[PDB]
Amino acid sequence: SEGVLLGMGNPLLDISCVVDDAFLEKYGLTLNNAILAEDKHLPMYKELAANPDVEYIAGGATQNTIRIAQWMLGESNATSYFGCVGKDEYGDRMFKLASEGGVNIRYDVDEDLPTGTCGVLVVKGERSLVANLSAANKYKIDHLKKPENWAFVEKAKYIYSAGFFLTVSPESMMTVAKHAAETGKYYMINLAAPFICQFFKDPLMELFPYVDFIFGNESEARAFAQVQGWETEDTKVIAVKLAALPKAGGTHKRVAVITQGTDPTIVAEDGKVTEFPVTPIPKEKLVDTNAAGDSFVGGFLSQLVLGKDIAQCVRAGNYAASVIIQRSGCTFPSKPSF
Ligand SMILES: Nc1ncnc2c1ncn2[C@@H]1O[C@H](COP(=O)(O)OP(=O)(O)O)[C@@H](O)[C@H]1O
Numbered sequence: 001s002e003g004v005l006l007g008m009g010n011p012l013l014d015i016s017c018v019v020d021d022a023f024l025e026k027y028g029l030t031l032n033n034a035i036l037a038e039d040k041h042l043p044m045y046k047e048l049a050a051n052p053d054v055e056y057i058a059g060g061a062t063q064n065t066i067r068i069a070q071w072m073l074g075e076s077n078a079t080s081y082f083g084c085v086g087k088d089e090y091g092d093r094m095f096k097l098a099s100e101g102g103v104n105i106r107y108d109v110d111e112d113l114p115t116g117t118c119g120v121l122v123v124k125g126e127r128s129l130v131a132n133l134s135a136a137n138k139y140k141i142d143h144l145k146k147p148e149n150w151a152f153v154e155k156a157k158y159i160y161s162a163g164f165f166l167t168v169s170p171e172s173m174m175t176v177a178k179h180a181a182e183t184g185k186y187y188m189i190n191l192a193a194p195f196i197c198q199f200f201k202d203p204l205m206e207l208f209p210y211v212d213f214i215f216g217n218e219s220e221a222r223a224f225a226q227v228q229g230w231e232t233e234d235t236k237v238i239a240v241k242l243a244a245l246p247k248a249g250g251t252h253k254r255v256a257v258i259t260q261g262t263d264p265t266i267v268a269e270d271g272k273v274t275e276f277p278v279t280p281i282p283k284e285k286l287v288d289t290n291a292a293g294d295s296f297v298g299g300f301l302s303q304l305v306l307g308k309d310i311a312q313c314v315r316a317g318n319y320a321a322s323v324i325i326q327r328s329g330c331t332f333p334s335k336p337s338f
């Protein structure tokens with residue numbers, strides 16, 4: 001099933017460090033939040049580089065999801081990934097790691113900007129993200145439309161992008177979403193962060209009629225609900241309302257999947273809510289929750305591309321996230337035991 005799943009996003013190198021409450025207060029950051037880097041965050045990246053516990057791990061939300069799906073599938077080149085990197089060592093490092101894991105990496109390159117990075121600040125297992133997109137922000141629709149890269153869109157039956165890609169190339173997302181609508185394929189996104197639901201609500205709502213599977217966490221679902229004027233904080237209601245939003249075509253229903261950390265995963269399908277409890281990981285065994293949501297999607301998608309039911313997809317998602325939260329960032333052993 002070569003290239004059955006394609007992802008498109010921002011390939012970033014995670015600069016991860018266990019810090020404390022004072023470091024977040026210093027740079028005005030919030031736990032369980034993601035922002036785009038500002039000039040005031042350049043001293044932060046310098047401080048992270050000098051910290052003795054700093055770790056450099058391949059990141060990027062879509063890339064994490066695709067690498068996890070590939071690990072769960074276990075058949076080389078079942079997945080593909082598009083994204084933009086710089087002509088530097090960080091770009092080649094992520095290329096080599098993901099390719100060796102079995103992902104068919106098709107990176108676009110920027111001539112002048114360095115490869116994108118993300119500050120991952122860990123406090124008692126929880127994380128705060130500060131993305132410096134750099135070359136990831138320069139993804140070109142020209143790369144997507146080149147025959148050798150368009151062939152992997154044609155080969156794919158499932159296409160996924162984290163909502164973070166709406167800040168970079170909403171035109172590339174629309175192009176592949178419209179292709180999927182014309183061919184009976186599945187187009188899927190995540191809400192990614194509250195800032196995406198608030199500041200990128202308009203490109204998000206232009207694409208939403210073409211979304212067959214919408215993924216998100218409870219804070220994103222609540223941020224989306226507040227933005228749309230839905231006077232509710234109930235994630236069960238928000239999940240049903242997300243599935244019920246208009247669709248460009250009736251070929252597929254829209255399934256909404258809302259994760260809630262240690263609380264049950266919510267699925268809205270055909271107007272009914274099903275909840276799937278999480279088996280919590282001991283606080284002792286917990287390293288960090290960075291890439292937990294991305295790995296839940298990766299696990300869910302690995303079963304979805306094999307034709308499994310939605311309950312088996314959620315079970316595989318909870319499994320993949322449980323494995324990843326017992327490691328730093330999006331890191332995993334070489335072979336699964338699902
Ligand atoms: N402490 C935990 N123990 C066990 N599983 C967890 C824990 N935290 C997260 N998970 C798993 O990771 C998934 C995603 O967590 P969540 O915090 O909702 O994601 P995100 O990274 O998008 O914030 C959960 O649905 C669950 O399966």
Ligand SMILES: Nc1ncnc2c1ncn2[C@@H]1O[C@H](CO)[C@@H](O)[C@H]1O
Nearest residue numbers: 010012059060061118129131164291
């Ligand atoms: N703006 C962004 N675009 C893409 N990936 C991002 C962004 N912000 C954070 N991430 C990624 O989110 C992951 C955790 O979900 C991290 O590995 C980090 O690299």
Ligand code: NA
Nearest residue numbers: 009010062162
């Ligand atoms: Na992404």
